[PDB]
A paper describes a structure:
In mammals, the E3 ligase [name] mediates the degradation of aberrant nascent polypeptides by targeting the C-terminal polyalanine degrons (polyAla/C-degrons). The E3 ligase [name] ([name]), also known as [name] ([name]), encompasses nine zinc binding sites throughout the full-length protein, with six in the N-terminal domain (NTD or CHY zinc finger), two in the central RING domain and one in the C-terminal domain (CTD). Here, we present the crystal structure of [name] bound to the polyAla/C-degron, which shows that the N-terminal domain and the RING domain of [name] form a narrow groove encapsulating the alanine residues of the polyAla/C-degron. Affinity measurements in vitro and global protein stability assays in cells further demonstrate that [name] recognizes a C-terminal A/S-X-A-A motif for substrate degradation.
Author numbering: 15 to 202
Amino acid sequence: RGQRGCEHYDRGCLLKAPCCDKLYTCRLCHDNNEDHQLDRFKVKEVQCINCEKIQHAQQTCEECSTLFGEYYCDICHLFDKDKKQYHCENCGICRIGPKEDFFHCLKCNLCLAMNLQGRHKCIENVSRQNCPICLEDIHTSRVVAHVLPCGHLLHRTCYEEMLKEGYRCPLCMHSALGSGSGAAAAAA
Ligand code: NA
Ligand code: NA
Ligand code: NA
Ligand code: NA
Ligand code: NA
Ligand code: NA
Ligand code: NA
Ligand SMILES: [Zn+2]
Ligand SMILES: [Zn+2]
Ligand SMILES: [Zn+2]
Ligand SMILES: [Zn+2]
Ligand SMILES: [Zn+2]
Ligand SMILES: [Zn+2]
Ligand SMILES: [Zn+2]
Ligand SMILES: [Zn+2]
Protein backbone atom coordinates (compact mmCIF):
# COMPACT_ATOMS: atom_id res chain seq x y z
CA ARG A 1 0.00 0.00 0.00
CA GLY A 2 1.10 3.55 -0.69
CA GLN A 3 3.30 2.95 -3.74
CA ARG A 4 0.87 3.55 -6.62
CA GLY A 5 -2.00 5.96 -7.13
CA CYS A 6 -2.77 9.58 -6.27
CA GLU A 7 -3.61 11.78 -3.29
CA HIS A 8 -7.14 10.34 -3.29
CA TYR A 9 -6.59 6.67 -4.06
CA ASP A 10 -4.22 3.75 -3.70
CA ARG A 11 -4.72 2.17 -7.13
CA GLY A 12 -2.71 0.37 -9.76
CA CYS A 13 -4.19 1.97 -12.87
CA LEU A 14 -5.23 5.24 -14.50
CA LEU A 15 -8.69 5.95 -15.88
CA LYS A 16 -9.07 6.95 -19.51
CA ALA A 17 -11.53 9.84 -19.35
CA PRO A 18 -14.02 9.21 -22.19
CA CYS A 19 -14.68 12.98 -22.28
CA CYS A 20 -11.27 14.48 -23.12
CA ASP A 21 -9.60 11.08 -23.76
CA LYS A 22 -6.95 11.90 -21.18
CA LEU A 23 -5.39 9.60 -18.59
CA TYR A 24 -6.02 10.67 -15.00
CA THR A 25 -5.35 8.64 -11.87
CA CYS A 26 -8.94 9.14 -10.68
CA ARG A 27 -12.10 11.13 -11.27
CA LEU A 28 -11.11 13.78 -8.69
CA CYS A 29 -7.68 14.20 -10.31
CA HIS A 30 -9.56 14.69 -13.56
CA ASP A 31 -12.20 17.05 -12.18
CA ASN A 32 -9.57 19.23 -10.51
CA ASN A 33 -7.91 19.72 -13.93
CA GLU A 34 -10.72 19.92 -16.48
CA ASP A 35 -13.36 22.50 -17.41
CA HIS A 36 -15.94 19.71 -17.19
CA GLN A 37 -16.76 16.83 -14.85
CA LEU A 38 -15.84 13.18 -15.47
CA ASP A 39 -18.67 10.60 -15.74
CA ARG A 40 -17.23 7.70 -13.76
CA PHE A 41 -19.86 5.25 -15.03
CA LYS A 42 -18.85 6.05 -18.62
CA VAL A 43 -15.21 4.99 -18.12
CA LYS A 44 -14.40 2.05 -20.37
CA GLU A 45 -10.62 1.78 -20.28
CA VAL A 46 -7.71 1.88 -17.85
CA GLN A 47 -3.93 1.82 -18.12
CA CYS A 48 -1.68 -0.27 -15.90
CA ILE A 49 0.72 2.09 -14.13
CA ASN A 50 3.34 -0.67 -13.93
CA CYS A 51 3.39 -1.84 -17.56
CA GLU A 52 1.32 0.87 -19.33
CA LYS A 53 -1.00 -1.69 -20.90
CA ILE A 54 -4.21 0.11 -21.82
CA GLN A 55 -7.08 -2.32 -21.45
CA HIS A 56 -10.70 -2.81 -20.48
CA ALA A 57 -11.50 -2.12 -16.83
CA GLN A 58 -10.75 -5.04 -14.50
CA GLN A 59 -9.21 -5.70 -11.08
CA THR A 60 -5.83 -6.98 -12.35
CA CYS A 61 -3.79 -6.18 -15.45
CA GLU A 62 -4.44 -8.50 -18.37
CA GLU A 63 -0.78 -8.40 -19.46
CA CYS A 64 1.31 -8.19 -16.28
CA SER A 65 -1.26 -9.06 -13.55
CA THR A 66 -0.44 -6.10 -11.30
CA LEU A 67 -3.19 -5.63 -8.71
CA PHE A 68 -5.15 -2.49 -9.67
CA GLY A 69 -7.22 -2.24 -6.47
CA GLU A 70 -7.90 -4.28 -3.32
CA TYR A 71 -11.49 -3.11 -3.78
CA TYR A 72 -12.81 -2.84 -7.32
CA CYS A 73 -16.33 -1.87 -8.39
CA ASP A 74 -17.08 -2.29 -12.09
CA ILE A 75 -20.02 0.16 -11.99
CA CYS A 76 -18.30 3.26 -10.60
CA HIS A 77 -14.92 2.03 -11.94
CA LEU A 78 -13.40 2.79 -8.53
CA PHE A 79 -10.09 1.24 -7.45
CA ASP A 80 -8.77 1.51 -3.90
CA LYS A 81 -7.21 -0.23 -0.98
CA ASP A 82 -9.69 -2.04 1.28
CA LYS A 83 -11.79 0.59 3.08
CA LYS A 84 -14.72 -1.84 3.61
CA GLN A 85 -16.46 -0.17 0.64
CA TYR A 86 -19.72 -1.40 -0.79
CA HIS A 87 -21.64 -0.26 -3.84
CA CYS A 88 -25.22 0.77 -3.09
CA GLU A 89 -27.64 0.60 -6.02
CA ASN A 90 -29.99 3.28 -4.60
CA CYS A 91 -27.20 5.75 -3.93
CA GLY A 92 -25.87 4.76 -7.34
CA ILE A 93 -22.28 4.97 -6.08
CA CYS A 94 -19.84 3.25 -3.76
CA ARG A 95 -20.08 4.04 -0.05
CA ILE A 96 -17.52 3.73 2.72
CA GLY A 97 -18.78 0.76 4.72
CA PRO A 98 -19.03 -1.60 6.35
CA LYS A 99 -22.40 -2.23 4.70
CA GLU A 100 -24.02 -3.59 7.89
CA ASP A 101 -23.60 -0.27 9.71
CA PHE A 102 -25.85 1.42 7.17
CA PHE A 103 -29.29 1.31 5.60
CA HIS A 104 -30.45 3.23 2.56
CA CYS A 105 -33.31 5.60 3.33
CA LEU A 106 -35.54 5.71 0.25
CA LYS A 107 -36.97 9.14 1.03
CA CYS A 108 -33.82 11.07 1.93
CA ASN A 109 -32.15 8.89 -0.74
CA LEU A 110 -28.80 8.18 0.90
CA CYS A 111 -27.28 5.54 3.16
CA LEU A 112 -27.67 6.23 6.89
CA ALA A 113 -26.30 4.67 10.06
CA MET A 114 -28.50 1.82 11.29
CA ASN A 115 -29.52 3.61 14.49
CA LEU A 116 -31.42 6.23 12.42
CA GLN A 117 -33.71 3.64 10.80
CA GLY A 118 -37.28 4.69 11.56
CA ARG A 119 -35.69 7.21 13.92
CA HIS A 120 -35.03 10.38 11.89
CA LYS A 121 -37.00 13.07 10.05
CA CYS A 122 -37.01 12.52 6.28
CA ILE A 123 -36.78 15.38 3.78
CA GLU A 124 -37.51 14.42 0.16
CA ASN A 125 -34.23 13.80 -1.71
CA VAL A 126 -32.41 16.07 0.75
CA SER A 127 -29.21 14.13 0.08
CA ARG A 128 -29.34 15.13 -3.61
CA GLN A 129 -28.78 18.76 -2.68
CA ASN A 130 -25.92 21.09 -1.98
CA CYS A 131 -24.77 21.61 1.57
CA PRO A 132 -26.34 24.94 2.64
CA ILE A 133 -22.96 26.03 4.09
CA CYS A 134 -20.55 25.37 1.24
CA LEU A 135 -23.19 24.87 -1.50
CA GLU A 136 -21.39 21.80 -2.83
CA ASP A 137 -23.04 18.41 -3.25
CA ILE A 138 -23.74 16.20 -0.22
CA HIS A 139 -24.65 12.94 -1.92
CA THR A 140 -21.41 12.21 -3.77
CA SER A 141 -19.09 13.90 -1.27
CA ARG A 142 -16.32 11.87 0.36
CA VAL A 143 -16.97 13.80 3.59
CA VAL A 144 -19.44 12.10 5.95
CA ALA A 145 -22.75 13.95 5.95
CA HIS A 146 -24.38 14.85 9.29
CA VAL A 147 -28.15 14.56 9.70
CA LEU A 148 -29.38 17.42 11.82
CA PRO A 149 -32.30 16.71 14.17
CA CYS A 150 -34.46 18.70 11.73
CA GLY A 151 -33.50 16.35 8.87
CA HIS A 152 -31.31 18.79 6.99
CA LEU A 153 -27.86 17.56 5.94
CA LEU A 154 -24.45 19.23 6.31
CA HIS A 155 -20.93 18.07 5.58
CA ARG A 156 -19.31 17.01 8.86
CA THR A 157 -16.56 19.57 8.23
CA CYS A 158 -19.02 22.38 7.52
CA TYR A 159 -21.12 21.34 10.48
CA GLU A 160 -18.19 21.48 12.92
CA GLU A 161 -17.06 24.88 11.63
CA MET A 162 -20.60 26.18 12.07
CA LEU A 163 -20.48 25.18 15.74
CA LYS A 164 -17.70 27.73 16.35
CA GLU A 165 -20.19 30.51 15.51
CA GLY A 166 -23.59 29.04 16.32
CA TYR A 167 -25.71 25.98 16.84
CA ARG A 168 -28.81 26.23 14.61
CA CYS A 169 -29.64 24.70 11.27
CA PRO A 170 -28.49 27.14 8.54
CA LEU A 171 -31.72 26.61 6.60
CA CYS A 172 -34.59 26.13 9.03
CA MET A 173 -32.92 27.73 12.09
CA HIS A 174 -33.98 24.88 14.40
CA SER A 175 -31.36 24.11 17.01
CA ALA A 176 -28.96 21.24 16.35
CA LEU A 177 -29.77 19.83 19.83
CA GLY A 178 -32.07 16.85 20.00
CA SER A 179 -33.13 13.53 18.56
CA GLY A 180 -32.70 12.11 15.09
CA SER A 181 -29.19 13.45 14.47
CA GLY A 182 -26.46 11.14 13.27
CA ALA A 183 -24.08 10.14 10.51
CA ALA A 184 -24.48 9.06 6.91
CA ALA A 185 -22.14 6.84 4.91
CA ALA A 186 -19.34 8.60 3.05
CA ALA A 187 -18.79 8.28 -0.68
CA ALA A 188 -15.81 6.06 -1.46
NA1 NA B 1 1.87 6.41 -9.12
NA1 NA C 1 -12.26 7.31 -9.35
NA1 NA D 1 -34.04 7.60 -7.20
NA1 NA E 1 -25.83 9.25 -9.00
NA1 NA F 1 -30.43 -1.08 2.55
NA1 NA G 1 -16.90 20.30 1.68
NA1 NA H 1 -15.45 7.67 6.65
ZN1 LIG I 1 -12.25 14.85 -19.43
ZN1 LIG J 1 -6.85 11.47 -7.70
ZN1 LIG K 1 0.23 -4.32 -16.40
ZN1 LIG L 1 -19.71 1.44 -7.05
ZN1 LIG M 1 -27.39 4.17 -0.39
ZN1 LIG N 1 -34.97 9.71 5.67
ZN1 LIG O 1 -20.66 21.61 3.15
ZN1 LIG P 1 -32.89 22.50 9.16
